[PDB]
With several copies, the nearest count.
Chain A
Amino acid sequence: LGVAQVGRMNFGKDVSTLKYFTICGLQEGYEPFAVNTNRDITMWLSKRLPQFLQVPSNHEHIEVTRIDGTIDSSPCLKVTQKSFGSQNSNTDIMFYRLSMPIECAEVFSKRDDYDFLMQTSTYYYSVRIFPGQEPANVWVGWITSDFHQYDTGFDLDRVRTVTVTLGDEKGKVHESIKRSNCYMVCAGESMSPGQGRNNNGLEIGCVVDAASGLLTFIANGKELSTYYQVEPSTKLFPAVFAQATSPNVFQFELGRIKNVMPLSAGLFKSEHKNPVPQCPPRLHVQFLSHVLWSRMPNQFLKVDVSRISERQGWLVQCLDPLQFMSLHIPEENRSVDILELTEQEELLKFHYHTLRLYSAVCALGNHRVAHALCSHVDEPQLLYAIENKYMPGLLRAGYYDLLIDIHLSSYATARLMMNNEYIVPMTEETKSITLFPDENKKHGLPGIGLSTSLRPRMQFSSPSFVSISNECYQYSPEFPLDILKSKTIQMLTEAVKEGSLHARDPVGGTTEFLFVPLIKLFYTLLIMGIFHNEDLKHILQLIEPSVFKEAPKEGLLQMKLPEPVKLQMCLLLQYLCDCQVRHRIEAIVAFS
């Protein structure tokens, strides 16, 4: 879509809305794109705000090389212009930043000396503007996560700034706070001697005091007048903005100066006490780019706007709740919608394996670890992941597995372990137990009935972290079992009807992703025994309508399931047979 251009694309989810398909496109044998899709197609657009991403190895202009640090040389990252001096060379200003930020202290305090180095919080990095690179076109300093300004002409005057002045009751301004996303200086103005010197490249050094928030710059061994004071807990990314006037533009030098700690000691918490400069592989140069996609939300907040009268003005009303699940990247201080991982492969894989690790650390009844994990992944996140239809299949399976492992697996395993033993107390209701419901020798619905055999006891503990007791670390964390049961039945009812239509878009992208996690959760609940009476009737009706009808539509058993789903159905039928055997054993004990 061009400037001031408006368009509409119809994917033909409703064939009736297509206005020219019948006259041209239906008879020819073509199909609407959303011919038999149950839900709307996710819509992706070009992102407006530029973001910082690692420089591709195949970038036509920018080349970044990592010079390892020797005994006498600091580790260096060198940014070079590949296509300088040739046609298609890009002359505009590039914005460069490093991947990891320096995080200032939460509360501000109010021959190098080893003790000073070990007690200090001051960190340093320096930049060598190479000879022949025009220094007035190069800026060095720090930026925050808010920097998304892409301008062909960048000047320090047009940086985004705000000054919050908190005053007392009488009006005196007792405190003034200056806030900005960019804290950088120019090399052209930094050069007091000026011109080009090849004894050493123009070396602006950035000094950050994490305990005071003071940003001071040193150019060629003399401190520049420009200084910045930042807010507590500010995350500052080393950044260099430069316009290429030579094949060699600038170089990040991760060294250290007298009594000032290296950048790695602040970036990495493992190297917090290591004065030796380091450039771990995680650190890498990132650049601002427009080449990224943005995902349109499937559903937006419903807002009603209207003017009641001249007196009342305009009314804005939003009364229906809507939530999205946000994935926060810790290193970049960036958060994205978890549904955007459908097109981001590396984050999807890493998060699926993180979910696997979450399931593994609490495996086989580690109730304390499960309680700890309840903080990281909670009931609302679990329920939203379970119910959401646009969740990627891998994340869907992982979240079903995590929900089963944290809350349900311990008691499910306990009842499975006690399943093959029949300790039947001999009571009045036990005597009342009979093989058949009535004189007609017709089997009752499996599971439904009066069972008196001794069963394991269900106990759960509320995962509260303000409490200082330790008795809660036995027993699995509590979950809203009634809500889980109702939602599982509702989701199975939806899945049976929708999958039979054989839609192009199942939940998770495949029938296996749609059914295996859902049927596994249903089987876990059945094994635990939450399903009682009417729930058992409905679920058996779903499994096979004809057989389990009380004394059309096809069930799960005859809907052409994949092999993994068939294995789960076999497990369900095995459990039903086990229930019938238990009923038989109890009836024999009753007769005895």
Chain B
Amino acid sequence: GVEIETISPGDGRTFPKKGQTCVVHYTGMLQNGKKFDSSRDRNKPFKFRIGKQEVIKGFEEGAAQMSLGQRAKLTCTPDVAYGATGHPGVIPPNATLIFDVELLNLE
């Protein structure tokens, strides 16, 4: 339920694997075009562990398929992103999320 479109190419050889943290900058948008989250707004790179159910699924598989240094747009359908209930106060119910994610470093 996630497709990946490349804005900037990566190395194409290094990919996230089990037990390896991903350092990314992301800018989440809805299909209507309104931004709702950005670590770039916070000047604060986002770190999460692959396979530890720490983030939304769509983000998880998007980062998994992305490579080191790659910038990709992640379109996460509601089934893999916050479901029907949505995020109270931020994400409306049954919302598809667009993410501009850059895989900074794998560590």
Q: Quick check: is A30 within 8 A (CB to CB) of the other chain?
A: no
Q: Does B54 contact A (CB under 8 A)?
A: yes
- At the interface, yes or no: A574 with Cβ under 8 Å from chain B? no
Other A-B pairs beyond A372-B90, A465-B28, 14, CB < 8 Å: A106-B32, A233-B31, A371-B89, A378-B41, A378-B42, A379-B41, A379-B42, A462-B42, A462-B44, A465-B37, A465-B87, A466-B59, A467-B54, A469-B54
Type the 1/0 row for A462-473, where 1 means its CB is closer than 8 Å to any CB of B: 111111110000
Interface status of B12 (Cβ within 8 A of chain A): no
Instruction: Kindly list chain A residues whose C-beta atoms are within 8 Å of the C-beta of B46.
Output: 464, 466
Which B residues lie within 8 Å of A465 (CB)?
28, 36-37, 87, 90-91
A380 in contact (CB, < 8 A): yes
Number of residues from A at the complex interface, CB < 8 A = 21
Contact, CB under 8 Å: B55 / A468: yes
- Is A369 engaged at the interface, CB distance under 8 Å to the other chain? yes
**In the assembled complex, which residues on chain A have CB atoms less than 8 Å from the CB atom of B88?**
372
Is A480 on the interface with B (CB-CB < 8 A)? yes
Evaluate contact between B38 and A378: CB separation under 8 angstroms.
Answer: yes
A375 CB–B CB distance under 8 Å: yes
Inter-chain contacts of A468 with B (CB < 8 A): 53-56
Q: Which residue of B lies closest to A469 (CB)?
A: B54
Question: Least Cβ distance of B32 to chain A in Å?
Answer: 7
Query: In the complex, which residue of chain B has the Cβ closest to the Cβ of A232?
Result: B31
Seen from chain A, the residues whose Cβ lies within 8 Å of a Cβ on chain B are 106, 233, 368-369, 371-373, 375, 378-380, 462-469, 478, 480
Known: A379-B42, A480-B43. A466 touches B37 (CB 8 A): yes
Q: Provided the pairs A106-B31, A469-B54 are in contact, do residues A464 and B89 lie with their beta carbons within 8 angstroms? A: no
B90 touches A375 (CB 8 A): yes
CB <8 Å contact, A464 and B39: yes
Question: Contact partner of A466 among B26, B53, B96, CB < 8 A?
Answer: B26
List 12 interface pairs A-B (beta carbons < 8 Å), by A numbering: A106-B31, A233-B31, A233-B32, A369-B89, A372-B88, A372-B90, A378-B38, A464-B39, A466-B55, A466-B59, A467-B48, A469-B54
Smallest beta-carbon distance B37→chain A, Å: 4
For the complex formed, measure the closest distance between the CB of B50 and the CB atoms of chain A, giving whole angstroms.
14
Pick the 3 closest A-B CB pairs, nearest first. Answer: A372-B89, A465-B37, A375-B90
* In the complex, chain B residues whose CB is within 8 Å of the CB of A373: 89
With a cutoff of 8 Å between Cβ atoms, the chain B residues found around residue A464 in the complex are 37, 39, 46
Q: Decide if B56 touches A466 in the complex (CB within 8 Å).
A: yes
Q: Are B31 and A375 in contact, with the CB atoms below 8 A?
A: no
Which residues of chain A have C-beta atoms less than 8 A from B55's C-beta?
466-468
Given A372-B88, A372-B90, decide whether A466 and B41 contact each other with a Cβ distance below 8 A. no
For window 8-45 of chain B, which residues contact chain A by CB distance below 8 Å? 26, 28, 31-32, 36-39, 41-44
Residues of B within 8 A of A371 (CB): 89
CB neighbours (8 Å) of A375 from chain B are 36-37, 89-90
Establish whether residues B89 and A466, one from each chain, have CB atoms under 8 Å apart when the complex forms: no
* Nearest CB of A to B55, in Å: 5
Chain B residues with Cβ below 8 Å from A106 are 31-32, 96
* Residue of chain B at shortest CB distance from A361: B89
Residues of A within 8 A of B37 (CB): 375, 464-466
B54 proximity list for chain A (CB < 8 A): 467-469
B43 cross-chain contacts in A, Cβ below 8 A: 480
- Chain B residues 66 to 107 lying within 8 A of chain A, measured CB to CB, are 87-91, 96, 99
Nearest B-chain residue to A103, judged by Cβ:
B32
Determine the residue in chain B with the shortest Cβ distance to A328.
Answer: B34
Residue in B28, B41, B59, B96 whose beta carbon sits within 8 Å of that of A380 in the complex? B41
Cβ of B42: which chain A residues have Cβ within 8 Å of it? 378-379, 462-463, 478
Q: Which residue of B lies closest to A378 (CB)?
A: B41
Residues in A with CB closer than 8 Å to B59 are 466
Q: How far is the CB of B81 from chain A (nearest CB, A)?
A: 9
Which residue among A467, A469, A478 has the maximum number of chain B CB atoms within 10 Å of its CB?
A467
Expressed in whole angstroms, the minimum distance between the Cβ of B38 and any Cβ of chain A is 7
Residues in chain A near residue B96, CB distance under 8 A: 106
Measured CB to CB, the nearest residue on chain A to B87 is: A465
Nearest to B60 among chain A residues (CB) is A466
B57's closest neighbor in chain A, by CB? A468
Q: Nearest Cβ distance between residue B58 and chain A, in whole angstroms?
A: 9
Contact status of A466 and B31, CB under 8 A, knowing A375-B90, A480-B43: no
Min distance, Cβ B46 to any Cβ of chain A, angstroms: 6
- Asked if B38 and A466 sit within 8 Å, CB to CB, the answer is no
Closest Cβ of chain A to B44, distance in Å, is: 6
Chain A nearest CB, measured from B27 CB (Å): 11
Q: Chain B CB within 10 Å — which of A368, A463, A466, A467 has the most?
A: A466
Contacts of B41 in A (CB 8 A): 378-380
Closest partner residue, chain A, to B32 (CB atom): A233
In the complex, how many angstroms separate the beta carbon of B3 from the nearest chain A beta carbon?
13
Q: What residues on B are CB-neighbors of A378 within 8 Å?
A: 38, 41-42
A233, A375, A462, A463, most chain B CB atoms within 10 A:
A375
A369 — which chain B residues lie within 8 A by C-beta?
89
User: Which residues from chain A contact B56 at a C-beta distance below 8 Å?
Assistant: 466, 468
B22 to chain A, nearest CB (A): 11
Most B Cβ at <10 Å: residue of A375, A463, A464, A465: A465
For residue A467, which residue of chain B has the nearest CB?
Answer: B55
Chain B's closest residue to A479 (CB) is B42
CB neighbours (8 Å) of A466 from chain B are 26, 28, 37, 46, 55-56, 59, 99
Q: Which residues of A contact B38 (CB under 8 A)?
A: 378
Q: Which residues of B contact A233 (CB under 8 A)?
A: 31-32
Of A373, A463, A464, A480, the most chain B CB neighbours within 10 A belong to A464
Whole-angstrom distance from the CB of B103 to the nearest CB of chain A?
14
Nearest neighbor of B58 in chain A, beta-carbon distance: A466
Closest residue of chain B to A106, judged by CB?
B31
The interface residues of chain A lying within 8 Å CB-to-CB of B39 are 464
Closest chain A CB from B102 CB (angstroms): 14
What residues of chain A lie closer than 8 Å to B44, measured between beta carbons?
Answer: 462
Chain A residues whose C-beta falls within 8 Å of the C-beta of B32 in the assembled complex? 106, 233
Of chain B, the residue at the smallest CB distance from A380 is B41
A474: shortest Cβ distance to chain B, in Å?
16
Contacting residues, chain B, for A463 (C-beta < 8 A): 42
* Chain A residue, CB-CB nearest to B99: A466
On chain A, the residues within 8 Å of B26 by CB distance are: 466
When distances are taken between beta carbons in the complex, the residues of chain A under 8 Å from B36 are 375, 465
